[PDB]
Amino acid sequence: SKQPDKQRKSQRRAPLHERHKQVRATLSADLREEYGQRNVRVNAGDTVEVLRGDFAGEEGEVINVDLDKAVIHVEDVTLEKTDGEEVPRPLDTSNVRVTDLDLEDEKREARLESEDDSA
Amino acid sequence: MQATIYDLDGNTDGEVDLPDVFETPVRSDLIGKAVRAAQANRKQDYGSDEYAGLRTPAESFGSGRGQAHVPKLDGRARRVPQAVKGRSAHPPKTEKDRSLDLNDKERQLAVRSALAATADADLVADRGHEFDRDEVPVVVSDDFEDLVKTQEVVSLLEALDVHADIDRADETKIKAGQGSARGRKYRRPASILFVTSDEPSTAARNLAGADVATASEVNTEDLAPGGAPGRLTVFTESALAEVAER
Amino acid sequence: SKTNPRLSSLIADLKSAARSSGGAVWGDVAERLEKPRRTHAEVNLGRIERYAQEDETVVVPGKVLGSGVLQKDVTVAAVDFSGTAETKIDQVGEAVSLEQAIENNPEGSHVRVIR
Amino acid sequence: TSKKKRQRGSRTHGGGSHKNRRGAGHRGGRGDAGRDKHEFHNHEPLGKSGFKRPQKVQEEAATIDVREIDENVTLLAADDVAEFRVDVRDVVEEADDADYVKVLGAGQVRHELTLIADDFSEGAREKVEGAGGSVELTDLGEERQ
RNA sequence: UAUGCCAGCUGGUGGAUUGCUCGGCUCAGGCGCUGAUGAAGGACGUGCCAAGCUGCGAUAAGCCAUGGGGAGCCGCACGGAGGCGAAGAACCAUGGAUUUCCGAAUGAGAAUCUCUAACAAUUGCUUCGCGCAAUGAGGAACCCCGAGAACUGAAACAUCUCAGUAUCGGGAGGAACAGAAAACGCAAUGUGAUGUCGUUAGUAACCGCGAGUGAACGCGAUACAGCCCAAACCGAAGCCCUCACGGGCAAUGUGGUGUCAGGGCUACCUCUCAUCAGCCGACCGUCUCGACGAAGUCUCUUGGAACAGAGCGUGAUACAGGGUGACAACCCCGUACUCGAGACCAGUACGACGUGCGGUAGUGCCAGAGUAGCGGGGGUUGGAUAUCCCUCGCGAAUAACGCAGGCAUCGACUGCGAAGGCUAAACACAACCUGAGACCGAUAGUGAACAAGUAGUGUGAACGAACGCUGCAAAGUACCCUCAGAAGGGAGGCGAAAUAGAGCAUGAAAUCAGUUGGCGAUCGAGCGACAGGGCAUACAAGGUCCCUCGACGAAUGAC
RNA sequence: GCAUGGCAAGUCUAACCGGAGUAUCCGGGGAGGCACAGGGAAACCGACAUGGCCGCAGGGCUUGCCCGAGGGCCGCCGUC
Ligand SMILES: [Cl-]
Ligand SMILES: [Cl-]
Ligand SMILES: [Cl-]
Ligand SMILES: [Mg+2]
Ligand SMILES: [Mg+2]
Ligand SMILES: [Mg+2]
Ligand SMILES: [Mg+2]
Ligand SMILES: [Mg+2]
Ligand SMILES: [Mg+2]
Ligand SMILES: [Mg+2]
Ligand SMILES: [Mg+2]
Ligand SMILES: [Mg+2]
Ligand SMILES: [Mg+2]
Ligand SMILES: [Mg+2]
Ligand code: NA
Ligand code: NA
Ligand code: NA
Ligand code: NA
Ligand code: NA
Ligand code: NA
Ligand code: NA
Ligand code: NA
Ligand code: NA
Ligand code: NA
Ligand code: NA
Ligand code: NA
Ligand code: NA
Ligand code: NA
Ligand code: NA
Ligand code: NA
Ligand code: NA
Ligand code: NA
Ligand SMILES: [Sr+2]
Ligand SMILES: [Sr+2]
Ligand SMILES: [Sr+2]
Ligand SMILES: [Sr+2]
Ligand SMILES: [Sr+2]
Ligand SMILES: [Sr+2]
Ligand SMILES: [Sr+2]
Ligand SMILES: [Sr+2]
Ligand SMILES: [Sr+2]
Ligand SMILES: [Sr+2]
Ligand SMILES: [Sr+2]
Ligand SMILES: [Sr+2]
Ligand SMILES: [Sr+2]
Ligand SMILES: [Sr+2]
Ligand SMILES: [Sr+2]
Ligand SMILES: [Sr+2]
Ligand SMILES: [Sr+2]
Ligand SMILES: [Sr+2]
Ligand SMILES: [Sr+2]
């Protein structure tokens, strides 16, 4: 709908399967040409480059993807706690760009390479 | 008078008689009245729950306990307008008629008057539109209706020294106030109005601040947004003719 | 607090003419139009026919309506005329706007006020 | 600025003493209370008067004055022109939902006319003839005797 | 200078203000019944750890199938541990499985348990056996049938009014009710079932003729649709249960015919596309859901962050809305276009099967009784002589008759066949779904943005609050000192900011601690206004002011 | 009542219908309302598009003298 309250609502309350679209990220130029899509659902296998926050300019492998919070953990993108331990700084996928895909799953690859649908 | 026709390349291609209506004396008060009415007529009825604040058997203790005679329940004041959680004294009401009437003649006169304001380059300029043209309104060949791509309309407008207005409208304003909490965060200037004949131009409609209409039903609002006469318009060969008998 | 822009201009033009020419009618007419609409004249043809005379412009500080019959060949100047009024008048004489009248006769001479 | 808009701060909003605007006592009773006592003034007087005949035994004539007809003779080009001839029934609006058409004699008749109507007034006739005209009573009009 | 006054400063207290919105409020469109095959509601269980909410039911936050979906998941809920998922989990849709006890609650009883095979109770059918079936209770309002106030208005009050309102009893549906004229009565050579909407109209009519109450015909619209019995004449030619056998019903009449375009019958003409029954069975439209879906994440500068400024570039049948570390068409979700499925429209429209429309002449064969109508008594209505109904009493004709046309009777005229019945669509509501907003923005808006009908009050009926905001990211404070100490304090670490450190954005006033200026232990009380002195004063946002003398010099006006 | 505005011997549509950019809006819809004649309980009858005199504003003239809308005082007309 056009009403702000409803829009935010449908987003925060979307069932799990509808949350994959909340973890999508734009694809590099090469990949876009390669699979005929502008973006994709970031997986725990892909490689990504940070284009916005304090970590803009860094690239790394995606270690985790939380659908509940719609965020991703990227290797080396961390914060150092008080006790010195290092923990990941969650990233919104819209601030990221996929530069390499993990196509170990037949289905994902088929979906990506299919034309009618996208991954 | 005479109006110059333009082809899809922006080149003169003959001309036709500007219909009489475009000579109707401009009446800003009538145009303002017509717009005010159309704006009021689409407003929705509202009002607070008629029982709001009345769901309580609260009663006043009266004299005797050194207290003001205020209805209370469980030691809490209620119902009355001065009481927190009490009813609204004279709130918005659903039964209220929020529409405005307007004689058909008076409204039709405004349409024609708003139409005529479209042929005065000085008014159009005073209204605020940005253009580098002398003749107004802009009359184009009917092939315009067959255009499909928005950018095709862009080229035609650039070739017509009229695209500046779209640039003017290519800036939204994020309004001050709580309208934002209800979906009215943005607003933007009104640019060019495209009047075609068969169906509104899908090719031009997405242009910043642009509006599209058909000669048979173009109204006072698209001709004079906000009630301000003199909108930079672009008619269609046939649109121009149909509008003559409005 | 008139709302019609054309009425305002007319009233200003009428004053300009009265203050700059040998006319008092225009200033007079200006004053009556400044008064509330309910006091403005509403004259039918029958009245013009009864008190008008040729070569004496009939001036109506209001609007001319079409009831009755006009036979005299006179020039009627009014704020406005109904569609029929203007039609019947043009047939045997001529219908003119106060704006035209003020320009052809700024001194406002040989004129008869009718209401 | 309106009167209403200027009342904030006045306390009484033009009502005078704050003890005035209470209930109906301030109006001497609700509705037309007292129309025969304290507020008898300017009220129609009490009582019955006359009677009414049943509505379906009532006739409603459709009238018109010669003045109306005569002033529009030429305009009524779509109607007879003899040595004019006009059937008033084809002139009077509301002539349908009426039981009959009657010509009244208000005004002047500056033309020779032959009028066809269901009925005429003494004066309507004296005038139409006086101007070298005639009057024709319709068949229905033949209900005078 | 104590006690202290006024104003401010630093820090509290407090939570105003500003900004924000997971909630409200209102409108609109769609859709609309559930239950003995045990509903709705409630109780009690159910999780590794589990109090609340949500879900579920001893298979207990779940089991199975098909389709979608997809590399993650194990609800709210951001823990620890452990586990599940490519044997395709999570999640969604459709269908199915399981579904404790109380509950209409139905074997009997009972404050959710207990005692010894159960449709309890009332009915229909009946194999007369609970064998086959029905009813019961729920649902926001809407709807139909009954019962029916008072406060109030009349400036008192009784008729009248409030009002057939509030409230009560009974009952159906998705809508109800009404409905194919014993009509209307613009009186006519006219209209043609019924709701409803606009109007007719505050008209006619009522009324302490006061206050007040108040239609209809018609017309313009919406939607349209018309049929079935009783009897005459036939007389078992019939119906229901069962696979069948067979049983039950039915001469107190099943079935045929027929239904005011009167019918039947006898004698003819012609013909059926009327009607009724059943079969098949949509388009489109609307509502919702879903698939697909263009174009920048380029340079410099500022910033913690670019979604800012300046520069360059791009899409648009898409410049609605939202999200993302700040003003985003081009970063993400979406949006336009195009496409798909379900639901409703609707078992309707069309189409097809069968039936067979109608007309002439003759015939007093048939056509609904406590009725039509009258009187007594009441209520009700605009209904006045002329509304509708209840009650008591009385009481007809038979189509060659009867009723109506706003007093009664009689004649004429016009209309129409009561006392049997069914009937789509157009209209009411808002539970449910979706959308919308010159509505409110946390003392507002719902009572309820939070544990909300929660906590809590009352024997009970019933009554009933308050509580929103860390941060870009928990990076949610390691180590050390102190202390009885997981307290608190100090120092320290993080972050742009801890004066963002947990009811943790901002942080008013009242007011409190400390303190600066002014006053102050010999002096008087609407706390000030206006003049004039003291003392006090960083910048900025005000820059004037004083004295000699001179010029001008009103009223007034000297030594 | 009043102010403003449209149209004017007329004026306005209501429900509702079609269109569409789909609650806005464009077109249609004059049913009906009020006004265009009154008086009378009713039956029923049915009027000054000007005949006279004053005269404000305004106009004219040869500068007091003409014309004088509106207005004022009368006549006369419709009906009980
Ligand atoms: Cl007149
Ligand atoms: Cl009468
Ligand atoms: Cl009729
Ligand atoms: Mg692909
Ligand atoms: Mg409240
Ligand atoms: Mg504000
Ligand atoms: Mg039991
Ligand atoms: Mg009383
Ligand atoms: Mg009553
Ligand atoms: Mg009284
Ligand atoms: Mg009543
Ligand atoms: Mg009637
Ligand atoms: Mg509240
Ligand atoms: Mg705070
Ligand atoms: Na309550
Ligand atoms: Na309303
Ligand atoms: Na008062
Ligand atoms: Na009629
Ligand atoms: Na529904
Ligand atoms: Na729990
Ligand atoms: Na279940
Ligand atoms: Na049963
Ligand atoms: Na039994
Ligand atoms: Na009283
Ligand atoms: Na009393
Ligand atoms: Na009474
Ligand atoms: Na982003
Ligand atoms: Na009786
Ligand atoms: Na009748
Ligand atoms: Na609050
Ligand atoms: Na001082
Ligand atoms: Na009409
Ligand atoms: Sr979750
Ligand atoms: Sr969560
Ligand atoms: Sr007392
Ligand atoms: Sr007053
Ligand atoms: Sr009161
Ligand atoms: Sr009174
Ligand atoms: Sr009296
Ligand atoms: Sr009519
Ligand atoms: Sr019909
Ligand atoms: Sr009968
Ligand atoms: Sr009679
Ligand atoms: Sr509060
Ligand atoms: Sr509420
Ligand atoms: Sr008690
Ligand atoms: Sr510290
Ligand atoms: Sr004293
Ligand atoms: Sr002096
Ligand atoms: Sr109209
Ligand atoms: Sr006169």
Taking each helix axis as running N to C, give the angle between helix B28-41 and helix B104-117, from 0 to 180 degrees, rounded to the nearest 10.
120
Question: Residues preceding discontinuities in chain D at C–N > 2.5 Å?
Answer: 83
Centre of ligand 29 from the C-alpha of residue B209, in Å: 69
Q: Which residues of chain C are within 8 Å of residue B29 when distances are taken between CB atoms?
A: 3-5
Q: Which residues of chain A are within 8 Å of residue B184 when distances are taken between CB atoms?
A: none
State how far the Cα of B112 lies from the Cα of B138, in Å rounded to an integer.
17
Which chains form contacts with chain A, at 3 or more CB pairs under 8 Å? B
State how far the Cα of A91 lies from the Cα of A48, in Å rounded to an integer.
11
State how far the Cα of B241 lies from the Cα of B141, in Å rounded to an integer.
12
How many domains does chain C fold into?
Answer: 1
Centre of ligand 7 from the C-alpha of residue A89, in Å: 62
Residue B165, CB, strand F, below 7 Å: no
Per the CB < 8 A criterion, the answer to whether B15 and B2 are in contact is yes
Whole-number Å distance, CA B148 to C1' E335? 18
State how far the Cα of B219 lies from the Cα of B193, in Å rounded to an integer.
11
What are the DSSP calls for B89-113, one per residue? Answer: SS---TT--------HHHHHHHHHH
State how far the Cα of B71 lies from the Cα of B60, in Å rounded to an integer.
4
Q: How many residues appear in chain C?
A: 115
Q: How many residues appear in chain B?
A: 246
State how far the Cα of D103 lies from the Cα of D48, in Å rounded to an integer.
35
Label the pairing between strands B138-140 and B233-236.
parallel
How many degrees, rounded to 5, is the angle at CA B165 between CA B42 and CA B235? 70
Overall resolution, Å: 2.2
- CATH at A41: 2.30.30.30
Nucleotide nearest to A82 (CA to C1'): E478
State how far the Cα of C17 lies from the Cα of A49, in Å rounded to an integer.
81
Q: Which residues pair with B233 in a beta bridge?
A: B193
Contacts 24+ apart (CB under 8 A), C36-41: C40/C79, C41/C114, C41/C115
Centre of ligand 30 from the C-alpha of residue B55, in Å: 20
Which among C36, C30, C32 is positioned nearest to C2, based on CA atoms? C36
Taking each helix axis as running N to C, give the angle between helix C25-34 and helix C5-20, from 0 to 180 degrees, rounded to the nearest 10.
150
Helix (H) or strand (E) holding B214: strand B211-214
Whole-number Å distance, CA D100 to C1' E279? 61
State how far the Cα of C51 lies from the Cα of C59, in Å rounded to an integer.
11
Label the pairing between strands C111-113 and C57-65.
parallel
Centre of ligand 2 from the C-alpha of residue D58, in Å: 7
Nucleotide nearest to D51 (CA to C1'): F41
CATH 3.40.1370.10 for domain B1-246: yes
Whole-number Å distance, CA B185 to C1' E327? 11
* Residue whose structure tokens are 């309580």: B56
Burial of B24 (0-12, 13-18, 19+ CB in 10 A): middle
- CATH at C91: 3.100.10.10
The one-letter amino acid code at B110 reads A
Q: Which residues neighbour ligand 33 (ion) by CB within 5 Å?
A: A 68
State how far the Cα of D19 lies from the Cα of D25, in Å rounded to an integer.
11
How many domains does chain A fold into?
Answer: 1
And the tokens for C14? 């009428």
Phi, psi of B152 (to 5 degrees): -65, -40
Which among C23, C31, C44 is positioned nearest to C102, based on CA atoms? C23
Per the CB < 8 A criterion, the answer to whether C30 and C14 are in contact is yes
And the tokens for B66? 């050194």
At least 3 CB pairs under 8 A between chains A and C:
no
Q: DSSP class of residue C54?
A: T
CATH placement of domain D51-144? 3.100.10.10
Nucleotide nearest to B29 (CA to C1'): F5
State how far the Cα of C28 lies from the Cα of C16, in Å rounded to an integer.
12
- Domain(s) of CATH 3.100.10.10: residues in chain D: 51-144
Nucleotide nearest to D68 (CA to C1'): F49
State how far the Cα of D13 lies from the Cα of B94, in Å rounded to an integer.
27
Helix (H) or strand (E) holding C7: helix C5-20
Q: Which residues pair with B12 in a beta bridge?
A: B6
Which chains form contacts with chain B, at 3 or more CB pairs under 8 Å? A, C
A3 close to B (CB below 8 A): yes
The torsion defined by the Cα of B18, B20, B21 and B22, in degrees rounded to 10, comes to: 40
Quote the minimal CA–CA distance from A61 to chain B in Å.
Answer: 39
Residue D96, CB, strand F, below 7 Å: no
Strand stretches in D66-108, DSSP E: 85-87, 100-104
State how far the Cα of B231 lies from the Cα of B182, in Å rounded to an integer.
29
Helix (H, G, I), strand (E, B) or coil at C68: coil
Which among C101, C115, C95, C94 is positioned nearest to C48, based on CA atoms? C115
Q: Which domain holds residue C107?
A: 1-115
Centre of ligand 21 from the C-alpha of residue A11, in Å: 30
Centre of ligand 16 from the C-alpha of residue B85, in Å: 26
State how far the Cα of C80 lies from the Cα of C64, in Å rounded to an integer.
6
Phi, psi of C81 (to 5 degrees): -135, 150
Residue D122, CB, strand F, below 7 Å: yes
State how far the Cα of D5 lies from the Cα of B156, in Å rounded to an integer.
53
Residue A18's alpha-carbon distances to A68, A72, B228, in angstroms, are 11, 17, 47
Whole-number Å distance, CA A1 to C1' E31? 21
State how far the Cα of C110 lies from the Cα of B87, in Å rounded to an integer.
72
Check B180 against A2: CB less than 8 A apart: no
State how far the Cα of A74 lies from the Cα of A60, in Å rounded to an integer.
6
Whole-number Å distance, CA B54 to C1' E148? 27
What fold, for D1-50?
A: Molecule: Ribosomal Protein L15; Chain: K; domain 1 (4.10.990)
What are the DSSP calls for C82-107, one per residue? Answer: -HHHHHHHHHHSEEEEHHHHHHH-TT
Per the CB < 8 A criterion, the answer to whether D127 and D105 are in contact is yes
Check C4 against B28: CB less than 8 A apart: no
| Chain C 77..106 CB hits on strand F (< 7 A) | 80, 82-85
Which chains form contacts with chain C, at 3 or more CB pairs under 8 Å? B
What are the DSSP calls for B32-95, one per residue? Answer: HHHHHHHHHHTPPP----TTTTT----B---SSSS-----EETTEE-SSTTSTTPPPSS---TT
Q: Which residues of chain B are within 8 Å of residue A2 when distances are taken between CB atoms?
A: 183
How many degrees, rounded to 5, is the angle at CA D89 between CA D85 and CA D93? 125
State how far the Cα of C113 lies from the Cα of D96, in Å rounded to an integer.
43
Q: Which residues of chain A are within 8 Å of residue B183 when distances are taken between CB atoms?
A: 2-4
Q: DSSP class of residue B18?
A: P
Domain ranges, ordered by start, for chain B: 1-246
D137 CB-side CA count, 13 A:
10
And the tokens for A50? 């940070």
Residue B107, CB, strand F, below 7 Å: yes
Name the method of structure determination: X-ray
Per the CB < 8 A criterion, the answer to whether C33 and C14 are in contact is yes
Strand stretches in A42-107, DSSP E: 47-50, 59-66, 71-74, 78-80, 86-88, 96-100
Q: What's the alpha-carbon Rg for chain D, to the nearest Å? A: 29
Per the CB < 8 A criterion, the answer to whether B213 and B195 are in contact is yes
C87 CB-near residues (< 8 Å, 6+ apart):
C66
Check B27 against C5: CB less than 8 A apart: yes
Whole-number Å distance, CA B211 to C1' F23? 20
Phi, psi of A26 (to 5 degrees): -65, 150
Which among C73, C48, C68, C69 is positioned nearest to C60, based on CA atoms? C48
The one-letter amino acid code at A73 reads H
Distance of CA B69 to the CA centre of its chain: 52
Burial of B104 (0-12, 13-18, 19+ CB in 10 A): exposed
Helix (H, G, I), strand (E, B) or coil at C5: helix
Buried b (16+ CB within 10 A) or exposed e, A81-105: eeeeeeebeebebeebbbbebebee
Q: Which domain holds residue A61?
A: 1-119
Q: Which of residues 172-191 of B touch A (CB under 8 A)?
A: 180-183, 185
